[PDB]
From a paper:
Single-particle analysis indicated that the two b0,+AT–rBAT subcomplexes are linked together with substantial flexibility, which was also evident in the human complex that showed a blurred TMD map in the consensus 3D refinement. To account for this flexibility, we performed multi-body refinement, taking individual heterodimers as rigid bodies moving relative to each other. This analysis not only revealed the swinging motions of b0,+AT relative to the rigid rBAT core, but also yielded an improved map for the individual b0,+AT–rBAT subcomplex at 3.0-Å nominal resolution. On the extracellular side, EL2 of b0,+AT is disulfide-bonded to the linker that connects TM1′ to the ectodomain of rBAT. Within the membrane, TM1′ and TM4 form extensive helix-helix packing interactions. We identified one cholesterol molecule bound tightly at this interface, which is in an equivalent position to that seen in LAT1–CD98hc10, suggesting a conserved cholesterol-binding site in the HATs. On the cytoplasmic side, the N-terminal helix (NH) of rBAT interacts with the C-terminal helix (CH) of b0,+AT. Our b0,+AT structure adopts the inward-facing conformation without any substrate bound. As in other LeuT-fold transporters, a putative substrate-binding site of b0,+AT is formed between the hash and bundle domains.
Cystinuria is caused by mutations in system b0,+, which is a Na+-independent cystine/dibasic amino acid exchanger localized at brush border cells in the kidney and intestine. Mutations of the regulatory glycoprotein rBAT and the amino acid transporter b0,+AT, which constitute system b0,+, are linked to type I and non-type I cystinuria respectively and they exhibit distinct phenotypes due to protein trafficking defects or catalytic inactivation. Here, using electron cryo-microscopy and biochemistry, we discover that Ca2+ mediates higher-order assembly of system b0,+. Ca2+ stabilizes the interface between two rBAT molecules, leading to super-dimerization of b0,+AT–rBAT, which in turn facilitates N-glycan maturation and protein trafficking.
Author numbering:
A (entry chain B): 29 to 483
B (entry chain A): 63 to 685
The structure:
């Protein structure tokens, strides 16, 4: 079995992704000063620990195969559980796949456009060619899914220590001019602080899918809250020790110029071989996308039992045991996302819908702990950590819409309510004609794509 | 038989061939053909996309005389702390580069200079830390800073010269020395070479008992660039200022670097003149003191030293030189060769020479620079400088607006001298007790900011130079409230020139022009909209454009005007009138561009051709 040292080595490699290479530009363009944008990586870094700890509670007491769909079924009933299954198939999961592949073409095409920004047609034609290739490889094969994963998480950590070591050595040589007079132009406001917590928290995406490790942990109840409260706080410490290593080299005015922040860094510090950064970051960013496509068939299976989502999506192909209808539908929605929007208009769109369901979950944590459920819970968290995560997330979901309204939020609210319409007219009322539109659809799809129900 | 829930063995009957087999492989091979046709399309777009414009090609420069911009500590002389206070005014003009003339520790602040230490700031301008705070404040605004560099001579108080007259160490050959007979205060020089300001160009030194060479006044001995010790010293000064963040240099007096080693006498212009009365620089043919053989390999060596700092993207170091006043084919050598790189452009001072505003005088300068220039080079247009009478005193107040609209719509980089956006003028008299060139001193008057003591420049008792008397009407504070002012038009042109994509890299077709009027268009291929600038330098006119362009509709919109009365008013092509210094930026749509025809391939100019794609919204260089 896996010990406590390995108990964190899985979670720390899980948290650090392609968010630390794209968000610094976006969190700084809203703080305007080096000083405050360093406390955002800590403030959101702590807020991600209390989130993952609260998720350890629901992960032990419910103890079901579903990821987060059970936790809303056990507390609020069937409508939030379905509404989450709806959004996590059309909003949360596809848009997070489009941001990872939009951020892989910012780093591949940034060197060939030295000195200026590349056109939008180049960073979308290259992203659309990554979504189709990542979703085709993961449908034809499974070995190739985990073949290149352990190497893609090596390049991810090789760069993380190269940027840190270089940004520390340069700090010993006295390059202190950038954070000498911090906080001078800090634009702290509910408008900026919220919009800068979105981009800071996107770099922590992956803390909710951390409960699966307990099955192989040596002593889960005693070590998992430990592997979390020392694993993620070790990562936020590796972010402020990496965002500091940016401002040591370049200034606050040159940061907002380039979208590929680490490419601007490798040219300034690693001139003999500066191509190493756009090459290694392109490895890790396409590896984190491989992790998203693997879990696409996961939730549709558990939601396929309760007749919430269509059961054809969980069918497996016979020649290769890969959830082909789940994948090619998971990517086809992403292609429709990279066309209208760009990275900054999608991190807001993603971190909006994702954070209301992140709130409803941990409120269900206390609501079940307060009145409805009296079952035994193996590990218990203090009462003050969940009430903070909900009071924080209620600020995160509601301040951006009122203070900095945008058209991205409208299309997000119209998506969930559209699923709410699909609840009554398709699963709640069970109309007669509603059936005869489903039955001929599923097996014809099965006929065309040679897929088979899993069990 | 369907029975929608279907395990493995049953559906293998249906899914075999019947109809659903051929769509599977034709759709699987479609997504494969597309994946290698999107990574093929992005490579085809990255390859055909042309290089974006550098920071010195993208926006105007702004030449500041640091002793006359803004005084901070009430001593009467501007300084580097006062330039930093006004950086927010400079960014309302959409300036990209701030060019500060020489501020080194000098013993002579004119006559091209006399520097005592190439690595210090003169006390009257501040201290070495006042400069580092200004270089930081400039970079945070998004601007760039280039400084004057003049490597030909030093002052006779420089440490190198004090050692050289003493014959100390290796410094004995930093300067050009020679033996000369000196008795009873009168010296015979080694030859008849003359100074640029006019007298024998050799001067006897009492400590060395030899004559030292100087092109300029006696306080400026010439460095000896023929020995490799001096070139490594000039190489460390270029490296000292680039490490502080300076974004490039402006090399001055470059034709005077090398001289002939044989020291033979020149040829007089009037051969039958007595060789003891030749005391004027203009009375000789200067074939041994200017532009010698190995001069261009020294300037190409300065460019390599600046290349060690211009490798990281976004921090290219600009190098510009001042042009030879007499020749234009000698000026174009500073552009370099297709395989040896040199100055990014030599500064075009030929517009600063016009003393009478005629249509053919301005037209001759434009076509002389653009046809003599090498192929893929970048032009620049400089309409003023510290060494010539200001534009309002050279041509007249009615030509301030027509002259800013000219240099902002021409191809290349416009270089503005401080106070030319508000229409400053020369002062009439001053009483200075320092050694300054009284012929070119009146174009350095303090900048007029508002109505106050000393036009708001000093806030002190006195200024180093008197401000112009009429600073109550022409100053920044008054001019940025008026609706139609020279400063208001200047902020409209530099904004239009900034984000148009048609003014920055469009073609330039110079249509025919009679005297008293100039007409030229800027056009790109896939833009489907052309600009037409009609500038009237004459008395007045009622000109019919339909005969001249043969591409224009009968109703065109006025995008800009110098009299500012035509904000958005449309006019009739049949009859347009221009009131003696009026300029219009006409703008219309057309599909027949002037450079595509055959009769205009002789009079259209572009640096790097690039067509436009509406569906891709990109520039591409394949067309
Ligand atoms: C996993 C790793 C992936 C790659 C990582 C990164 C690899 C690179 C890492 C690092 C870059 C290495 C250093 C490069 C320095 C600059 C070199 C340069 O400009 O060369 C050009 C070569 O001319 C060309 O045409 C170059 C074409 C480049 C195509 C890029 C690949 C696109 C698809 C990637 C795969 C997608 C797969 C998706 C599915 C997986 C110069 O040509 P030019 O005509 O002189 O200038 C034209 C351009 N400008 C300058 C004018 C603007
Ligand atoms: C060369 O230098 C001599 C000085 O030795 C200049 O002669 C003087 O010029 C000034 C002009 O303001 C007169 O006031 C003096 O009377 C002149 N001195 C004598 C002794 O005549 C001479 O002009 C210089 N040559 C130039 C400038 O071409
Ligand atoms: C060039 O200078 C010479 C003088 O060195 C001019 O020749 C004549 O010189 C005598 C000197 O006694 C004068 O009296 C004459 O008046 C001069 N002739 C003139 C002025 O025509 C010669 O003319 C000069 N040439 C030019 C082209 O200026
Ligand atoms: C897993 C990691 C350690 C593998 C990479 C090891 C090597 C290639 C790395 C580790 C630390 C790096 C150094 C860190 C800091 C600096 C200072 C900088 O001004 C120049 C580059 C230089 C000198 C780096 C050179 C490359 C370097 C020596
Ligand atoms: C699977 C097979 C059958 C069809 C695949 C079609 C794919 C390759 C096509 C369909 C629509 C296309 C997109 C249409 C419009 C845009 C916007 C443009 O600014 C960049 C390219 C981009 C984003 C295209 C990328 C390629 C694209 C996604
Ligand atoms: C030059 O020599 C004299 C005579 O000894 C001496 O006084 C003076 O200091 C020397 N100057 C320099 C710069 O060496
Ligand atoms: C000596 O000086 C006088 C100064 O009046 C001068 O006339 C004379 O020619 C000089 N003699 C020599 C030999 O230089
Ligand atoms: C100078 O301008 C100010 C406005 O800032 C105005 O109040 C004042 O009257 C002006 N003075 C003169 C003499 O015009
Ligand atoms: C200018 O003159 C006034 C008159 O008293 C004096 O107070 C002031 O100090 C003078 N300015 C300076 C800089 O000395
Ligand atoms: Ca010389």
């Amino acid at each position: 079995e896996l010990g406590l040292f390995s108990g964190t080595c899985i979670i720390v490699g899980t948290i650090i992704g392609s968010g630390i290479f794209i968000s610094p530009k976006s969190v700084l363009s809203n703080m305007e000063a080096v000083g405050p944008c360093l406390i955002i990586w800590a403030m959101c870094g702590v807020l991600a620990t209390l989130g993952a700890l609260c998720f350890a509670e629901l992960g032990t007491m419910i103890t079901k195969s579903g990821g987060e769909y059970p936790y809303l079924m056990e507390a609020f009933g069937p409508i939030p559980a379905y509404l989450f299954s709806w959004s996590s198939l059309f909003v949360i999961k596809p848009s997070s796949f489009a941001i990872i592949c939009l951020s892989f073409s910012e780093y591949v095409c940034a060197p060939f456009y030295s000195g200026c920004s590349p056109p939008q047609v180049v960073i979308k034609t290259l992203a659309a060619a990554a979504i189709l290739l990542i979703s085709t490889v993961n449908a034809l094969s499974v070995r190739l899914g985990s073949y290149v994963q352990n190497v893609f998480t090596a390049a991810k950590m090789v760069i993380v220590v190269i940027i840190i070591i270089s940004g520390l050595v340069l700090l010993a040589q006295g390059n202190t001019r950038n954070f000498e007079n911090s906080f001078e132009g800090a634009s702290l406001s509910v408008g900026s602080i919220s919009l800068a917590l979105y981009n800071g928290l996107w770099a922590y995406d992956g803390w909710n899918q951390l409960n699966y490790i307990t099955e192989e942990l040596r002593n889960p109840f005693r070590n998992l809250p430990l592997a979390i409260i020392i694993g993620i706080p070790l990562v936020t410490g590796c972010y402020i020790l990496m965002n500091v290593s940016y401002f040591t080299v370049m200034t606050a005015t040159e940061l907002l110029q380039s979208q590929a922040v680490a490419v601007t860094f490798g040219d300034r510090v690693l001139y003999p071989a500066s191509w190493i950064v756009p090459l290694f970051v392109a490895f890790s960013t396409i590896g984190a996308a491989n992790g998203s496509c693997f879990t696409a068939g996961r939730l549709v299976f558990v939601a396929g039992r309760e007749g919430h989502m269509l059961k054809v999506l969980s069918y497996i192909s016979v020649k290769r045991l890969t959830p082909a209808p789940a994948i090619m539908f998971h990517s086809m929605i992403a292609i429709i996302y990279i066309i209208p929007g760009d990275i900054n208009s999608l991190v807001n769109y993603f971190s909006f819908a994702a954070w209301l369901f992140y709130g409803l979950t941990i409120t269900g944590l206390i609501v079940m702990r307060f009145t409805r459920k009296e079952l035994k819970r193996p590990i218990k968290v203090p009462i003050f950590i969940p009430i903070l995560v909900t009071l924080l997330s209620v600020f995160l979901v509601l301040a951006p819409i009122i203070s900095a309204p945008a058209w991205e939020y409208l299309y997000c609210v119209l998506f969930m309510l559209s699923g709410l319409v699909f609840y009554f007219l398709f699963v709640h009322y069970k109309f007669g004609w509603a059936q005869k539109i489903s039955k001929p659809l599923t097996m014809h799809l099965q006929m065309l794509m040679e897929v088979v129900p899993p069990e | 038989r369907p029975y929608a829930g279907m395990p493995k063995e049953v559906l293998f009957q249906f899914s075999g061939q019947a109809r659903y087999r051929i769509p599977r492989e034709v759709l699987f091979w479609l997504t494969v053909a597309s994946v290698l046709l999107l990574i093929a399309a992005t490579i085809a777009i990255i390859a055909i996309s042309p290089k974006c414009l550098d920071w010195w090609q993208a926006g105007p420069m702004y030449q500041i005389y640091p002793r006359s911009f803004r005084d901070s500590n009430k001593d009467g002389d501007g300084d580097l702390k006062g330039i930093q206070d006004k950086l927010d005014y400079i960014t309302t003009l959409n300036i990209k580069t701030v060019w500060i003339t020489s501020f080194y520790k000098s013993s002579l602040k004119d006559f091209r200079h006399a520097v005592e230490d190439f690595q210090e700031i003169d006390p009257i301008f501040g201290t070495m830390k006042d400069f580092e705070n200004l270089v930081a404040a400039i970079h945070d605004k998004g601007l760039k800073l280039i400084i004057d560099f003049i490597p030909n001579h030093t002052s006779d108080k420089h440490a190198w010269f004090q050692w050289s007259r003493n014959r100390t160490g290796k410094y004995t050959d930093y300067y050009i020395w020679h033996d000369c007979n000196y008795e009873n205060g009168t010296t015979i020089p080694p030859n008849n070479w003359l100074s640029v300001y006019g007298n024998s160009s050799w001067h006897f030194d009492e400590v060395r008992k030899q004559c030292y060479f100087h092109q300029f006044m006696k306080e400026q001995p010439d460095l000896n660039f023929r020995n490799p010790d001096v070139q490594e010293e000039i190489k460390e000064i270029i490296q000292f200022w680039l490490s502080k963040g300076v974004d490039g240099f402006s090399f001055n007096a470059l034709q005077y670097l090398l001289e002939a080693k044989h020291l033979r006498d020149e040829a007089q212009v009037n051969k039958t003149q007595i060789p003891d009365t030749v005391t004027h620089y203009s009375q000789l043919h200067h074939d041994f003191t200017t532009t010698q053989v190995g001069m261009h390999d020294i300037v190409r060596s300065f460019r390599q030293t600046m290349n060690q700092y211009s490798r990281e993207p976004g921090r290219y170091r600009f190098m510009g030189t001042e042009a030879h006043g007499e020749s234009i084919t000698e000026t174009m050598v500073y552009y370099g060769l297709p395989f040896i790189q040199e100055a990014d452009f030599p500064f075009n001072s030929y517009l600063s020479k016009l003393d009478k505003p005629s249509g053919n005088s301005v037209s001759e300068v434009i076509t002389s620079w653009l046809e003599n220039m090498p192929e893929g080079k970048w032009p620049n247009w400089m309409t003023g400088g510290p060494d010539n009478v200001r534009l309002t005193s050279r041509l007249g107040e009615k030509y301030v607006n027509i002259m800013n609209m000219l240099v902002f719509t021409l191809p290349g980089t416009p270089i503005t001298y401080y106070g030319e956006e508000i229409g400053m003028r020369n002062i009439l008299a001053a009483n200075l007790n320092e050694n300054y060139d009284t012929g070119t001193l009146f174009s350095k008057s303090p900048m007029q900011w508002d109505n106050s003591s000393n036009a708001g420049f000093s806030e002190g008792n006195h200024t180093w130079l008197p401000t112009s008397s009429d600073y109550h009407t022409v100053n920044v504070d008054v001019q940025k409230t008026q609706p139609r002012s020279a400063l208001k038009l200047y902020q409209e042109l530099s904004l239009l020139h900034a984000n148009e994509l048609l003014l920055s890299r469009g073609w330039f077709c110079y249509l025919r022009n009679d005297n008293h009027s100039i007409m030229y268009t800027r056009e790109l291929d896939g833009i489907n909209k052309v600009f037409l600038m009609v500038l009237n330098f004459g008395e007045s006119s009622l000109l019919n454009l339909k005969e001249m362009i043969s591409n224009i509709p009968t109703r065109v919109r006025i995008r800009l005007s110098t009299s500012s009365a035509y904000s958005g008013r449309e006019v009739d092509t049949h009859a347009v009138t221009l009131a003696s210094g009026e300029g219009l930026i006409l703008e219309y749509n057309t599909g027949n561009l002037l450079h595509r025809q055959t009769a205009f391939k002789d009079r259209c100019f572009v640096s790097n051709r690039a067509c436009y794609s509406r569906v891709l919204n990109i520039l591409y260089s394949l067309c």
